[PDB]
Design a protein around this ligand. Sequence first.
Ligand SMILES: [Ca+2]
Ligand SMILES: [Ca+2]
Ligand SMILES: [Ca+2]
Ligand code: NA
Length: 285
Amino acid sequence: RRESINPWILTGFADAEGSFGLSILNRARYHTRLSFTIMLHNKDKSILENIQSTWKVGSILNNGDHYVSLVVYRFEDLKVIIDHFEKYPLITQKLGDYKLFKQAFSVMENKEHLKENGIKELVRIKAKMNWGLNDELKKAFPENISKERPLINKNIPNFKWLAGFTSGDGSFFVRLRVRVQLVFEISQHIRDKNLMNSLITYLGCGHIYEGNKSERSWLQFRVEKFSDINDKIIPVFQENTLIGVKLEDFEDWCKVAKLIEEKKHLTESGLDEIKKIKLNMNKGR
DNA sequence: GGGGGCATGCAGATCCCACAGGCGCG
DNA sequence: CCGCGCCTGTGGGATCTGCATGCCCC
Ligand SMILES: [Ca+2]
Ligand SMILES: [Ca+2]
Ligand SMILES: [Ca+2]
Ligand code: NA
């Protein structure tokens, strides 16, 4: 097939679903492997097939019977990833993992990792990447095992980025309690609270719910007023369209919202049509 | 000729998704 | 009374992330 993704839409999807990896396994020879991975359900397998088509790089492998992932692992292959994220930077705290990813690329590019000092520099880089060093790798190289990293406070660059972030970690659904209510919600780890609260001002609507800050690792940005949803959330994603099955979930979302606008959610066939839309909305296509 | 990186995966940990009920308020 | 929407709460899987190596080339 043939497809191409907007560069800013892709960065937003990377901020939500991407992952930068640096594995150092024993072979004192060491297996060092840089990677960038986006693993998704098979329902969204065409995104990864399309992102591979945009970057013209990467491999697609099966992960189980229901999941698929795009993994970029070759050295020359990783050059296109950095060139994309140098001009379209990541916004969430994952950008720090990319920064350490870029440093690791340069060390391997200069062939420094083939010596003892080069491996020591990368295990120090890996210490700050994602979940840090494992217990076995922390047995050696206890010099700089500090897993903490400078936090990343950044603002939303554009709505094209938001479409890719929403396509990842967002959700469009409809509640029936009978009464009809459309709800838009984005969840995220508490580490990007300042970025999540940016959406209140960036969108002019929505609320932030956290619960007990202790013993809960993630907050929620949610908008429930229909006026804010029909006027300030749906047009902004019609101009900057989403990707993956989230688009079709969003498509049927506005189809239901059009019925609520015409006040047609009182007829028996209106809710019967609304219920049929929901029956294949998120559990289905 | 062999050391390092490619090929192509498999396995673990958790951050999400897609909701739920209660209820004060206009 | 009706119905909207703030507010608190969540199971579990789709994510994020980690682990693995025989074999290829140069
Ligand atoms: Ca995410
Ligand atoms: Ca997702
Ligand atoms: Ca996600
Ligand atoms: Na959705």
